[PDB]
Amino acid sequence: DGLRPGDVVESFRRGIPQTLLNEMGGKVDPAILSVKTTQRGNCLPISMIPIGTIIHNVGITPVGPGKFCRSAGTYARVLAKLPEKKKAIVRLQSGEHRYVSLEAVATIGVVSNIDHQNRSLGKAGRSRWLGIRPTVRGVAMNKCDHPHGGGRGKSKSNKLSMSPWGQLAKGYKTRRGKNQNRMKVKDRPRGKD
Amino acid sequence: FKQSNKGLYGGSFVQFGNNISESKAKTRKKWLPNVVKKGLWSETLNRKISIKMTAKVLKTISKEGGIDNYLTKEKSARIKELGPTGWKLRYRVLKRKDEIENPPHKRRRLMSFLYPLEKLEYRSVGKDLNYKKFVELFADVPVKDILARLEDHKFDLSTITV
Amino acid sequence: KSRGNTYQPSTLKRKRTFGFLARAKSKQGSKILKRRKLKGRWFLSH
RNA sequence: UAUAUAAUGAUAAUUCUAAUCUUAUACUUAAUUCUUAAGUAAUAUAUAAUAUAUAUAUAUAUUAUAUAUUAUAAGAGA
RNA sequence: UGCUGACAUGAGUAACGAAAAAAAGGUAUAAACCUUUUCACCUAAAACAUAAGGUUUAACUAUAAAAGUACGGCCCCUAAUUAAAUUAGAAUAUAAAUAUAUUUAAGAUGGGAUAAUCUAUAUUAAUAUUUAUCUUAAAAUAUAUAAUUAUAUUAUAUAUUAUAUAUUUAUAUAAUAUAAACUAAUAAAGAUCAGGAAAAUUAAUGUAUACCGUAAUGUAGACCGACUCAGGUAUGUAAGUAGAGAAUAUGAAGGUGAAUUAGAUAAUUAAAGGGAAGGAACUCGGCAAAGAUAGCUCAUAAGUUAGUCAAUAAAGAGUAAUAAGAACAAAGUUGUACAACUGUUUACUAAAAACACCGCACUUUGCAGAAACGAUAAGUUUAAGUAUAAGGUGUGAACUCUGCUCCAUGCUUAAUAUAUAAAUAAAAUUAUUUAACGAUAAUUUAAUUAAAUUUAGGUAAAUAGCAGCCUUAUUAUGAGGGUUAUAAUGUAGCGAAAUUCCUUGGCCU
RNA sequence: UAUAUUAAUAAUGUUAUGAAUAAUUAUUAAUAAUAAUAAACUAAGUGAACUGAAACAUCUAAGUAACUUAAGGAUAAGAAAUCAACAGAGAUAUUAUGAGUAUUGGUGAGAGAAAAUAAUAAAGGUCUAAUAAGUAUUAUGUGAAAAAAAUGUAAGAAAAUAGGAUAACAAAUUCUAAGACUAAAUACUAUUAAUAAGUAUAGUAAGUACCGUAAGGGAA
Ligand SMILES: [Mg+2]
Ligand SMILES: [Mg+2]
Ligand SMILES: [Mg+2]
Ligand SMILES: [Mg+2]
Ligand SMILES: [Mg+2]
Ligand SMILES: [Mg+2]
Ligand SMILES: [Mg+2]
Ligand SMILES: [Mg+2]
Ligand SMILES: [Mg+2]
Ligand SMILES: [Mg+2]
Ligand SMILES: [Mg+2]
Ligand SMILES: [Mg+2]
Ligand SMILES: [Mg+2]
Ligand SMILES: [Mg+2]
Ligand SMILES: [Mg+2]
Ligand SMILES: [Mg+2]
Ligand SMILES: [Mg+2]
Ligand SMILES: [Mg+2]
Ligand SMILES: [Mg+2]
Ligand SMILES: [Mg+2]
Ligand SMILES: [Mg+2]
Ligand SMILES: [Mg+2]
Ligand SMILES: [Mg+2]
Ligand SMILES: [Mg+2]
Ligand SMILES: [Mg+2]
Ligand SMILES: [Mg+2]
Ligand SMILES: [Mg+2]
Ligand SMILES: [Mg+2]
Ligand SMILES: [Mg+2]
Ligand SMILES: [Mg+2]
Ligand SMILES: [Mg+2]
Ligand SMILES: [Mg+2]
Ligand SMILES: [Mg+2]
Ligand SMILES: [Mg+2]
Ligand SMILES: [Mg+2]
Ligand SMILES: [Mg+2]
Ligand SMILES: [Mg+2]
Ligand SMILES: [Mg+2]
Ligand SMILES: [Mg+2]
Ligand SMILES: [Mg+2]
Ligand SMILES: [Mg+2]
Ligand SMILES: [Mg+2]
Ligand SMILES: [Mg+2]
Ligand SMILES: [Mg+2]
Ligand SMILES: [Mg+2]
Ligand SMILES: [Mg+2]
Ligand SMILES: [Mg+2]
Ligand SMILES: [Mg+2]
Ligand SMILES: [Mg+2]
Ligand SMILES: [Mg+2]
Ligand SMILES: [Mg+2]
Ligand SMILES: [Mg+2]
Ligand SMILES: [Mg+2]
Ligand SMILES: [Mg+2]
Ligand SMILES: [Mg+2]
Ligand SMILES: [Mg+2]
């Protein structure tokens, strides 16, 4: 968010540099590392990011890229650290608490363009430019097409809201059963908000 | 069932049959063997052969005491069970066992010695000779001659060294 | 508008899709050529 | 009173792994893009000895057996 | 309504397919062919030059001429995409066929050096979408007497005069000369919708210049339409006059005037012009037709979402017009219903109130993911994206607002509540056989053993639902009230509605 | 660059001051090549639907049509872990009787054998295997309409002092699975000869003209 042409950033994914280690001025002994870490823009592992920090570009593995909280105005918070399990608990923009590798990547600060959600396309041509073709509602279709189709006049056919291929579209958990998220402390609000 | 050419399936293929309902309605269905990917240690090759087999074939390995034994059994049943791949693995195993069993001595340096002489003679008469055609000509000539130089050794391809 | 003019000639497409190679370079086209030969047709493909 | 210390099972949870699974990157003789069999110059492992403090453990010359001239790194895991 | 073949009737009937033609001559042969003249028609084409296509149809067999600098192809390079090709026994998957991922090869609608002062491609020596061209600058002129503006010019395209040559090749240049359009090369710069891939220099030698296209047709008699078919068909130039213009009028050159002609012009039909008196009295309906008092410069209201939206406002003014005296552009207000709007739709009877939309809500998916595809898998799109992303669903901009209910169908969360199906390490037990043991076919039990199922919630911008009955203010009528059923009993708003049968409902204009 | 190249008799025009030449050598030895690849018959994988049952789903059609793959002049089968019934036979493959009998079925439409006796046929009996183990058998899901050997998943023997065969048991018979070869009688095609109460609309053209973009259709 606060990044402007002129600023200076750095990454500590490889680690603290010899430039400071040998100089002893900014080395860990006086613990200037805290104030060198919790500044927006730079990149650090969760291990050396303090608790409660607002971060973005979170990884899953110690050797993997930043995957979560990568869109405009998105951020996550570091909730817990578990050194014995080499894990950390992070809450994502979905409101979900999740386990992540303690030595995973993360950048300090919110992702820019916070107001991207207040934008308003004024015409269908703008969607067409962006690459979005028209969407045809199921009710407007025929019964051979979307199940909602058919019926004289406007009618929903007493058919539970569902996709064209017969999958319920209101509240039906799609990821269900044994194949769920192994790394998941708490689920997202899911209507609480 | 070309899936089986790549593995040791023990001569078991897919089975296409019917699915019967309580109303005795039929619907075509298919039975697959229980293929499992496994790496079995081979002593003669001194390495792990990694292949897809059926659990039955793996159990047969456990009985017979090794992938080498399984591949090198003699019965026609086994010859049929061992598919195209198994056949090649069997060839490798038996070749390796043979070369371990009987080493060559239980000629290439003399070919090298004779190479320059023939090369020079061909050069003198106006022709040429390269290493490939040289070995092709003198591949199968047991008896050598002493037309030039002197044989100051008695190796004679028998009991090399003291 | 008016109909009837569905065939719009273009030698490039004619040869690419109905040419001899377009059929001899595949399983199905090879079968078409073989069937026409067996029937004894004079002209196998464009 | 007026059914588990033990022997076993069921359920829940955590741990380990060569079960399983997913991502990433020089010569000598012998049968001149090759192989094999014995030894090597340097890149790497276990236990015995150098010499340190507490009354279970550091760091190295050199040697003992199996190898490179599939593998590592990360993740899930009975 | 048999099949094929031949021949009839309709019948010498309808038609001969947008069209200007006339003489003289070729020819005492001609409406139809050729020539000359006259007349017309197309002329931002019916002309010229081309692409694609095609029974060479052409000005033809004696026939369409290329080393390249305006010659295309061929060739180098790649896009989209394609490929019995490609990958320690082993690239992955798959009833076969085959399908994935990677390589390689192919593949334009694209890019590719030099060149009129004319030019040289080969071998051996190193490895830049799209759009625009200032309020303001300087001289001299029209400028006024400090204006300031009015302009070549605030940037390019070349030919002449002079100051000089190496026996006048390249320069340093000071002067002279543009009115309006357009072109290819600069320089600077505007929005967001953020704008292709691919093949590297000097030296020394070297070049005898391969192959193929080239006619004519190409808003068409030369292609696609069964036809010498009023249909379909890609580019550039497209005289001048006039205009804002590629509108409209003319038409200089060019091309053309047609497999139907000559008379006659009844009823009647089509296309077109005029019309007394009246002006929608026609009709289901002003359907059709008629109606324009500048086209430039001014001026232009109520509403309004503040957008000259309404607006190209209406009415009106200025400019020669005063009896009129080209074509073309321009065809008035107002209420209501539906839909925010531009757009899309039933190729060939429906263009709309239907679809879409921007906007608004709900919901799923933490990425080793939801969604779709895959005789099914690998795998692919999603996406080289990450909850402000992607999929699904309903509604359909915005103002004012969106009330009550989980009964039912589902979704969703827990209940140490609860059937069972398959799967086994044992035997409290009958039947059969057997001299016999023994061999064959069961019911109960285990520390054992799901999802469902029913219990309790939550969920309606999920699918859905939103009632009846009776007197009191000595009256029609019913603020209060009394009663049965329910999950609850239709709130705000609107109302004879595109929803009202009765119904031309009652009243007003 | 199969007129493509180390070696040779001499060189034009030149070789950073007796050899090595972009047009090349009478020459001689060595080194990369050429997919015309039918049909029918046979075996195997997957396999419909119309239809019949006077409807329809079990059943039928039917393991047929079609697609896919792979051989040979043929392929396939083949010398009993077979039949049979106390007496016996003795390998395959077709045909007649047995016989529309046994058997079987929403006991419906319907389907349906083997012993045994004859015919065709060839010399028709042979050894190649250290005699056969995740095999026989068992449970379970499928599996030629009667009759059955293969087949997914998982447990799993014995040695001729043994094993297979029948719902089961006993007795008796019969044969030896997990190793193999095999002419002939047969199928298709192509020639030759013979006979046609066959064809001139089954009598030679042409898969042409022509129709469709194509697969494909198809004349006189
Ligand atoms: Mg997109
Ligand atoms: Mg939308
Ligand atoms: Mg929509
Ligand atoms: Mg509809
Ligand atoms: Mg449906
Ligand atoms: Mg509808
Ligand atoms: Mg047609
Ligand atoms: Mg195509
Ligand atoms: Mg008549
Ligand atoms: Mg008449
Ligand atoms: Mg007439
Ligand atoms: Mg005349
Ligand atoms: Mg015009
Ligand atoms: Mg003009
Ligand atoms: Mg022309
Ligand atoms: Mg050229
Ligand atoms: Mg290429
Ligand atoms: Mg091109
Ligand atoms: Mg041309
Ligand atoms: Mg021309
Ligand atoms: Mg037509
Ligand atoms: Mg025409
Ligand atoms: Mg004009
Ligand atoms: Mg003219
Ligand atoms: Mg013309
Ligand atoms: Mg005409
Ligand atoms: Mg007339
Ligand atoms: Mg009148
Ligand atoms: Mg009048
Ligand atoms: Mg009227
Ligand atoms: Mg009337
Ligand atoms: Mg009108
Ligand atoms: Mg007013
Ligand atoms: Mg106003
Ligand atoms: Mg008009
Ligand atoms: Mg609309
Ligand atoms: Mg519209
Ligand atoms: Mg229509
Ligand atoms: Mg419209
Ligand atoms: Mg999915
Ligand atoms: Mg969304
Ligand atoms: Mg709607
Ligand atoms: Mg709205
Ligand atoms: Mg509501
Ligand atoms: Mg049970
Ligand atoms: Mg078959
Ligand atoms: Mg029937
Ligand atoms: Mg019926
Ligand atoms: Mg045979
Ligand atoms: Mg049958
Ligand atoms: Mg045997
Ligand atoms: Mg035996
Ligand atoms: Mg069984
Ligand atoms: Mg059957
Ligand atoms: Mg036997
Ligand atoms: Mg045609």
Side-chain angles (χ1 to χ4, degrees), chain A residues 121-137:
Chain A
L121 313 183
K123 61 175 186 174
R126 211 161 306 264
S127 295
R128 299 301 299 273
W129 304 338
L130 298 163
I132 311 174
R133 296 197 79 258
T135 295
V136 182
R137 314 180 324 276

Side-chain angles (χ1 to χ4, degrees), chain A residues 101-114:
Chain A
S101 293
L102 188 57
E103 212 285 317
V105 70
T107 48
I108 320 307
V110 186
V111 181
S112 64
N113 205 357
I114 316 300

Side-chain angles (χ1 to χ4, degrees), chain B residues 35-149:
Chain B
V35 175
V36 303
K37 181 170 194 59
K38 204 76 183 160
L40 302 173
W41 177 264
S42 172
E43 305 86 331
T44 296
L45 271 47
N46 176 357
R47 77 188 180 88
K48 292 200 302 185
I49 303 175
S50 53
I51 52 173
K52 294 223 281 293
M53 49 200 85
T54 71
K56 183 190 273 211
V57 171
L58 185 61
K59 156 191 289 170
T60 304
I61 302 298
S62 304
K63 165 193 290 163
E64 284 205 36
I67 188 64
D68 299 3
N69 294 10
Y70 176 83
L71 294 175
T72 60
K73 203 193 164 82
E74 179 51 23
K75 259 50 183 176
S76 80
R78 184 54 46 72
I79 298 284
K80 304 182 194 65
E81 300 153 2
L82 297 179
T85 300
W87 184 254
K88 300 192 208 280
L89 288 176
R90 168 172 181 138
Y91 175 68
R92 292 311 212 210
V93 170
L94 295 174
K95 267 286 188 207
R96 184 80 184 104
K97 215 172 71 163
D98 279 303
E99 79 180 9
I100 282 293
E101 197 276 325
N102 49 4
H105 294 288
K106 194 181 187 176
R107 64 222 178 252
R108 283 273 174 177
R109 60 170 170 171
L110 317 89
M111 279 332 103
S112 167
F113 291 159
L114 189 141
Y115 172 69
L117 174 67
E118 302 297 320
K119 167 158 168 43
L120 277 186
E121 287 181 15
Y122 275 17
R123 200 63 189 167
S124 77
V125 303
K127 310 183 297 189
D128 288 330
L129 184 64
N130 44 47
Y131 63 103
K132 284 290 139 171
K133 193 66 182 292
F134 162 64
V135 86
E136 282 170 10
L137 269 75
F138 312 91
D140 296 330
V141 283
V143 178
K144 294 287 140 292
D145 87 347
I146 196 170
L147 81 168
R149 207 160 52 213

Side-chain angles (χ1 to χ4, degrees), chain A:
Chain A
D1 202 55
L3 199 65
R4 294 291 200 270
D7 326 300
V8 188
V9 313
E10 80 298 342
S11 165
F12 292 131
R13 184 172 170 84
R14 285 264 164 81
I16 201 65
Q18 186 65 253
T19 309
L20 278 301
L21 287 157
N22 61 17
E23 279 182 4
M24 175 34 232
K27 190 249 285 183
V28 71
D29 185 50
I32 308 301
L33 193 152
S34 172
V35 70
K36 187 66 188 88
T37 292
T38 181
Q39 186 173 355
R40 99 165 76 80
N42 66 1
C43 183
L44 314 95
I46 295 332
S47 60
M48 47 194 287
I49 278 153
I51 296 298
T53 313
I54 285 181
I55 60 170
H56 71 277
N57 205 57
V58 183
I60 287 164
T61 88
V63 297
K67 296 210 164 200
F68 307 145
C69 294
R70 219 169 81 201
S71 187
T74 191
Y75 71 72
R77 184 169 316 266
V78 188
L79 290 179
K81 288 185 199 177
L82 297 172
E84 81 295 20
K85 305 202 141 63
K86 282 177 331 314
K87 269 157 151 24
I89 301 182
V90 180
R91 144 188 81 84
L92 311 173
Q93 191 130 297
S94 54
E96 157 178 322
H97 309 342
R98 186 216 156 87
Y99 284 94
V100 171
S101 293
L102 188 57
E103 212 285 317
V105 70
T107 48
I108 320 307
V110 186
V111 181
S112 64
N113 205 357
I114 316 300
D115 174 277
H116 167 85
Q117 91 281 45
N118 301 7
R119 95 183 181 282
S120 176
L121 313 183
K123 61 175 186 174
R126 211 161 306 264
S127 295
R128 299 301 299 273
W129 304 338
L130 298 163
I132 311 174
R133 296 197 79 258
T135 295
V136 182
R137 314 180 324 276
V139 288
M141 282 177 204
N142 285 344
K143 267 293 188 180
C144 57
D145 289 323
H146 202 294
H148 292 191
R152 303 299 183 208
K154 288 180 229 193
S155 65
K156 291 176 173 186
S157 304
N158 207 342
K159 201 79 169 185
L160 302 160
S161 298
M162 60 179 58
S163 79
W165 313 275
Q167 173 170 106
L168 295 99
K170 305 285 180 168
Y172 180 72
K173 288 187 174 179
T174 54
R175 199 175 179 184
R176 63 197 305 122
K178 289 190 218 275
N179 50 25
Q180 269 177 327
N181 196 359
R182 293 178 179 83
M183 308 268 289
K184 182 195 209 175
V185 173
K186 167 166 156 139
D187 61 356
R188 55 183 175 92
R190 193 176 300 268
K192 156 184 172 61
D193 299 353

